[PDB]
Chains A and B, each alone.
Chain A
Amino acid sequence: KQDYYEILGVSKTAEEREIRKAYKRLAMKYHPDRNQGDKEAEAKFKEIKEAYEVLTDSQKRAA
């Protein structure tokens, strides 16, 4: 429901190379494996991934 671009925090026109940099650092922050704490991080992380996956695909990004 939340804006893809905004949860990663991107310019909305920045290129694939940058969104990958943002994904990796966000994957660091919210990975369950890293904190080990809770499902809350894994639930959030799964969405940061889902945004990284839709934005690297050219056609699905246009959508």
Chain B
Amino acid sequence: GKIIGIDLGTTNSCVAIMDGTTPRVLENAEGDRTTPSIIAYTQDGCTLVGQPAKRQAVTNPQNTLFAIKRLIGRRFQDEEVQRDVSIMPFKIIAADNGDAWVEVKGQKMAPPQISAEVLKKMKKTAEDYLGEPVTEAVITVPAYFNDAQRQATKDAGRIAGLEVKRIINEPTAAALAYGLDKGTGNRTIAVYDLGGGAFDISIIEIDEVDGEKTFEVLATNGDTHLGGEDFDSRLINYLVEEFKKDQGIDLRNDPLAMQRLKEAAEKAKIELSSAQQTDVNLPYITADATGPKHMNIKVTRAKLESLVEDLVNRSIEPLKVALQDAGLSVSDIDDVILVGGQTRMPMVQKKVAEFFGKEPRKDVNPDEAVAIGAAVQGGVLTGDVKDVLLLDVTPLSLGIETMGGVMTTLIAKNTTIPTKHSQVFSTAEDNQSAVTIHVLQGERKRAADNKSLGQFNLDGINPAPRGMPQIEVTFDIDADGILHVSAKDKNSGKEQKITIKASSGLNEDEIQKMVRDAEANAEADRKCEELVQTRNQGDHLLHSTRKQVEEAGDKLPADDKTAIESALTALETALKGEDKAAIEAKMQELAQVSQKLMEIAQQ
């Protein structure tokens, strides 16, 4: 088949495909090229994705999920997860194994399911355009995603009914999307990605040798929990503090008011990317005991810049670190490109431009470059583009915990992937039954200060003196950037089974069940689409019949008129409901009674 490309964003998602030799982004059902990454669960059993979900969020706050990318692959006790727990309208809860989940209508749900709903909308869009089924996709993740996040995204892709060929890092995808225009030559570029939830910086070299583009990632750094949402949060906090200051009401209790306030806040930020002053104007924001209250606050561009300056500065440090790891200076960067909606803010462009002493390119669409890059990568996997190769790296050092809590690096950060590293382990005590290895990702010197991938237990070590047996352990990092640990008896070659404990993520059982539930939800959503179309047919029939009655006038039996009008009203009532069977029944009855009218037509 064909491999579609999916930019799965914190805020907006996007799907692009490979029209032979020229990739194109596909508009969704509503005609938008970018689909909001919002997922709503209605009372009636339907599932809304994108702009509809965005519309009905105010009446269904607890069941409208957003920013799930900022929970996927994370633990419930993570600091950022707790801070979000206090903030979000929906209920974030700890799973059975400690992973961060969300509760919808009393059901516990894993982030890969929700993100899989979004993925399903993208896949269905691609199928509608293509006219044939789609089973294979390349999905984008931030460069700084840890192992558990990447594996969790891959699982979300599997629940979407997709065979995930490649997990691509967003700045890398944008890099080749930018690189297809360029001719033969050598360049070095800095990709600055500041989206709705994540920030990445990647230093990438693009050399052309024998008609074969080589995109080598020299370095990468970033923060997976820094994005537009936090700019929004700063402006929100300012508005709340000013409202409590002027009217005496802490607005953080009213969740509806907080929803209206986040909408207005982001709107004001975006409006301040091109104006010099806007007004946050919310009438009847809340109801005091004495009477309803109002908000009308002036915000200058300078005020917003002051409110988010430390956030902007938080992004400059990984530039220094990345240039250090790449062994380059600011003057070695031939081009710098901005990716992500949040880079549209004038201050971000100014701070970046002044760090590099250079003006970023202007011919890059930050909203559409990642997706088209993913589509092209899919083309590389199939074969339709043979002139491009991508050499990505892993962003985090992979090590094990040793005595004293210190961490020991096995594979350092910025190592080109896929890669393999083997090491010999042995027993430490006489007749040691088993050995346990603590595998983690991060740069900190204490094991507790890093992200634990888990404890791998090699049981079934027959008794022996301390230190005699030799077991070779092999650490693999595939092209997705995901770890695969295999073991083997060094001397003999007999394999060694590995038990993973204290780990994160879904397993095969959870996966299968959630695939089945995804299919069931798919059939249910088909039925919902059916009900919408049937409701349209009903409204058309109402209009047609009333028109025909007026045209008929007095020349219609009073009994017939009466019965038809009763049937009409019954049908209108059925059309206000959500029962397809009742609507169809009422339509049929209306036809039976309006037989005389349709006879009166007579051409």
- Chain B 192-217 against A: per-residue CB contact (8 Å), 1 yes, 0 no? 00000000000000010110101010
Known: A24-B214, A42-B478. A34 touches B418 (CB 8 A): no
- A28 x B381 contact (CB < 8 A): no
A24 is contacted by which of B209, B380, B381 (Cβ under 8 Å)?
B209
Interface residues of B in 205-243 (CB under 8 A from A): 207, 209-210, 212, 214, 216
Give chain B residues whose Cβ lies under 8 Å from the Cβ of A27. Answer: 214, 389, 391
- B380 x A34 contact (CB < 8 A): yes
- Chain A 20-42 against B: per-residue CB contact (8 Å), 1 yes, 0 no? 01001101100111101000001
- B380 x A33 contact (CB < 8 A): yes
CB proximity of A37 to chain B, nearest CB, Å: 11
Give chain A residues whose Cβ lies under 8 Å from the Cβ of B214. Answer: 24, 27-28
- B479 x A33 contact (CB < 8 A): yes
Q: Is B69 an interface residue (CB 8 A)?
A: no
- A32 x B207 contact (CB < 8 A): no
Interface residues of B in 400-422 (CB under 8 A from A): 416, 418-420
Closest residue of chain A to B392 (Cβ to Cβ) is: A33
- A33 x B419 contact (CB < 8 A): no
Give chain B residues whose Cβ lies under 8 Å from the Cβ of A45. Answer: 418
A31 to B216, CA, bound (A): 13
A31 to B418, CA, bound (A): 9
- B209 x A33 contact (CB < 8 A): no
CB proximity of B6 to chain A, nearest CB, Å: 18
CB proximity of A15 to chain B, nearest CB, Å: 17
Q: Is the interface of A mostly helix, strand, loop or mixed?
A: helix
- A24 x B207 contact (CB < 8 A): yes
- B380 x A46 contact (CB < 8 A): no
Q: Is B256 an interface residue (CB 8 A)?
A: no
Q: Is B166 an interface residue (CB 8 A)?
A: yes
- A34 x B389 contact (CB < 8 A): yes
- A46 x B212 contact (CB < 8 A): no
- A32 x B418 contact (CB < 8 A): yes
Closest residue of chain A to B166 (Cβ to Cβ) is: A33
CB proximity of A29 to chain B, nearest CB, Å: 10
- B416 x A33 contact (CB < 8 A): no
Q: Is B390 an interface residue (CB 8 A)?
A: yes
- B479 x A46 contact (CB < 8 A): no
Interface residues of B in 133-192 (CB under 8 A from A): 165-166
Give chain A residues whose Cβ lies under 8 Å from the Cβ of B391. Answer: 27
Known: A46-B419, A49-B416. A32 touches B389 (CB 8 A): no
Interface size class of B (residues with CB under 8 A): 20 to 34
Closest residue of chain A to B391 (Cβ to Cβ) is: A27
Known: A28-B389, A49-B416. A36 touches B209 (CB 8 A): no
Closest residue of chain A to B216 (Cβ to Cβ) is: A24
Give chain B residues whose Cβ lies under 8 Å from the Cβ of A36. Answer: 165, 381-383
- A28 x B416 contact (CB < 8 A): no
A34 to B416, CA, bound (A): 15
CB proximity of A49 to chain B, nearest CB, Å: 6
Known: A21-B209, A25-B209, A28-B212. A33 touches B390 (CB 8 A): yes
A42 to B383, CA, bound (A): 17
CB proximity of A1 to chain B, nearest CB, Å: 13
Closest residue of chain B to A46 (Cβ to Cβ) is: B420
Give chain A residues whose Cβ lies under 8 Å from the Cβ of B419. Answer: 46, 49
Give chain B residues whose Cβ lies under 8 Å from the Cβ of A33. Answer: 166, 380-381, 389-390, 479
CB proximity of B227 to chain A, nearest CB, Å: 29
Closest residue of chain B to A43 (Cβ to Cβ) is: B420
Closest residue of chain A to B390 (Cβ to Cβ) is: A33
A45 to B419, CA, bound (A): 9
A42 is contacted by which of B209, B210, B418 (Cβ under 8 Å)?
B418
A41 to B210, CA, bound (A): 21
CB proximity of B260 to chain A, nearest CB, Å: 47
Give chain B residues whose Cβ lies under 8 Å from the Cβ of A24. Answer: 207, 209, 214, 216
Give chain B residues whose Cβ lies under 8 Å from the Cβ of A21. Answer: 209
Known: A24-B207, A33-B390. A46 touches B381 (CB 8 A): no
A42 to B166, CA, bound (A): 14
- Chain B 389-400 against A: per-residue CB contact (8 Å), 1 yes, 0 no? 111000000000
Closest residue of chain B to A52 (Cβ to Cβ) is: B416
- A31 x B389 contact (CB < 8 A): yes
Interface residues of B in 372-386 (CB under 8 A from A): 380-383
Interface residues of B in 92-145 (CB under 8 A from A): none
A46 to B193, CA, bound (A): 29
A34 to B212, CA, bound (A): 11
Give chain B residues whose Cβ lies under 8 Å from the Cβ of A43. Answer: 420
Give chain B residues whose Cβ lies under 8 Å from the Cβ of A34. Answer: 380, 389
CB proximity of B290 to chain A, nearest CB, Å: 67
Give chain B residues whose Cβ lies under 8 Å from the Cβ of A25. Answer: 209-210
A42 to B477, CA, bound (A): 11
Give chain A residues whose Cβ lies under 8 Å from the Cβ of B478. Answer: 42
A25 to B380, CA, bound (A): 16
CB proximity of A12 to chain B, nearest CB, Å: 23
Give chain A residues whose Cβ lies under 8 Å from the Cβ of B166. Answer: 33
Give chain B residues whose Cβ lies under 8 Å from the Cβ of A46. Answer: 418-420
A49 to B597, CA, bound (A): 81
Apart from A24-B216, A34-B389, A42-B418, list 13 A-B contacts with CB within 8 A: A24-B207, A24-B214, A27-B389, A27-B391, A31-B389, A33-B166, A33-B479, A36-B381, A36-B382, A42-B478, A46-B418, A49-B416, A50-B420
26 A/B residue pairs, CB under 8 Å, sorted by A: A21-B209, A24-B207, A24-B214, A24-B216, A25-B210, A27-B214, A28-B212, A28-B214, A28-B389, A33-B166, A33-B380, A33-B381, A33-B389, A33-B390, A34-B389, A36-B165, A36-B382, A36-B383, A43-B420, A45-B418, A46-B418, A46-B419, A46-B420, A49-B416, A49-B419, A50-B420
Binding site for B on A (CB under 8 A): 21, 24-25, 27-28, 31-34, 36, 42-43, 45-46, 49-50
The 7 A-B pairs at the shortest CB distance, nearest first, are namely A46-B420, A36-B381, A42-B418, A33-B479, A24-B214, A28-B389, A34-B389
